Design a protein around this ligand. Structure first.
Ligand SMILES: Nc1ncnc2c1ncn2[C@@H]1O[C@H](COP(=O)(O)OP(=O)(O)OP(=O)(O)O)[C@@H](O)[C@H]1O
Ligand SMILES: [Fe+2]
Length: 325
């Protein structure tokens, strides 16, 4: 069967088309923010504008008509209200026009589920992006958050640090490059508070030290990553130890980071468990992961009535019963 997926929780609009086994099309367009930061209304306008263009490009790349599609899937949340609302409207408008069933998909769950297309069974998922940072796994018929960020996502924290260092958006790859040339570890506040992550204290200290003049920017970047990532690794390990799962997945836009991968590979091999990172177009926000999870949901007999499709800005990961596992 085939599923169309529309992703637009934040700045990226993404449309994907998938089967149970294959990605047929996966196309993107991100809102260019030269000054960085989050722009809820600007994103909504980008999404309304780019909607038809991306749909056409997705259908051409897949090589099917909209009448080939068995189910329409959209990102229901969590995310930004105005952006989610333009995505939901588009998904509902396609569902009516072509008389297709519709399904609202949880954004974080979709980041982990997409890895099952590649033969991952039941992992602990480290989801790291701009807005989100969560460690999640299947426990008691649903996804449990074992540790999330108390404040900002690790991607956002790196972006704020980058912007302050004069490195424009996207700050992530730029900070990684700078970090590779670091030679000195500079003490910075630990980012683990209980089960959860706190990067705000780490960030403000890094900025304070940068403004002091006393340090190499490259050394500050290196230290910023080691502290941030060691914390991610530790909270990931704790989850693996409790769940007793044989595989870890690393997903989200920050999953491109080679130093973070390296450290997860070390942890997983020291424990004798698998490690897998999907292709990058399937790590960052994309419509294909929505399409795939939407497909699984539909095949398990899930189908949404109109009021079930209303967007959920604060959609919690554990609100969805994973009846398809
Ligand atoms: N190599 C990298 N190392 C570290 N961070 C990276 C790297 N590549 C991208 N990022 C970060 O990932 C973020 C972008 O991720 P993504 O494309 O998933 O969009 P997003 O808006 O963060 O999605 P969401 O907020 O819905 O999770 C940016 O903060 C960017 O700096
Ligand atoms: Fe995301």
């Amino acid at each position: 069967m085939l599923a169309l997926g529309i992703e637009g929780t934040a700045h990226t609009l993404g449309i994907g088309i998938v089967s149970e086994d294959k990605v047929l099309a996966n196309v993107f367009d991100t809102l260019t923010t030269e000054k960085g930061g989050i722009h809820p209304k600007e994103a909504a306008e980008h999404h309304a504008r780019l909607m038809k263009p991306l749909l056409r490009k997705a259908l051409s790349e897949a090589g099917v008509s909209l009448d080939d599609i068995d189910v329409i899937a959209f990102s229901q949340g969590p995310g930004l209200g105005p952006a989610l609302r333009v995505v939901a409207t588009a998904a509902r408008a396609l569902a009516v026009k072509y008389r297709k069933p519709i399904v609202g998909v949880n954004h974080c769950i979709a980041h982990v589920e997409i890895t099952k297309m590649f033969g991952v069974k039941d992992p602990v998922g480290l989801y790291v992006s701009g807005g989100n940072t969560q460690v999640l796994a299947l426990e008691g018929g649903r996804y449990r958050v074992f540790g999330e960020t108390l404040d900002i996502g690790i991607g956002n924290a790196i972006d704020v640090f980058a912007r302050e260092l004069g490195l424009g958006f996207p700050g992530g790859p730029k900070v990684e490059k700078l970090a590779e040339k670091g030679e000195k570890y500079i003490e910075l506040p630990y980012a683990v508070k209980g089960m959860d992550l706190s990067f705000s204290g780490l960030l403000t200290e890094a900025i304070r030290k940068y403004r002091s003049g006393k340090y190499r920017v490259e050394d500050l970047a290196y230290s910023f990553q080691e502290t941030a990532f060691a914390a991610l690794v530790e909270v990931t390990e704790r989850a693996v130890a409790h769940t007793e799962k044989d595989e870890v997945v690393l997903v989200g836009g920050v999953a491109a980071n080679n130093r973070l991968r390296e450290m997860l590979r070390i942890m997983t091999e020291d424990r004798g468990i698998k490690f897998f990172v999907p292709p990058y177009d399937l790590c960052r926000d994309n419509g294909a992961m929505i399409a795939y999870t939407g497909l699984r949901m539909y095949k398990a007999g899930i189908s949404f009535r109109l009021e079930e499709t209303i967007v959920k800005q604060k959609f919690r990961t554990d609100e969805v019963e994973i009846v398809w596992h």
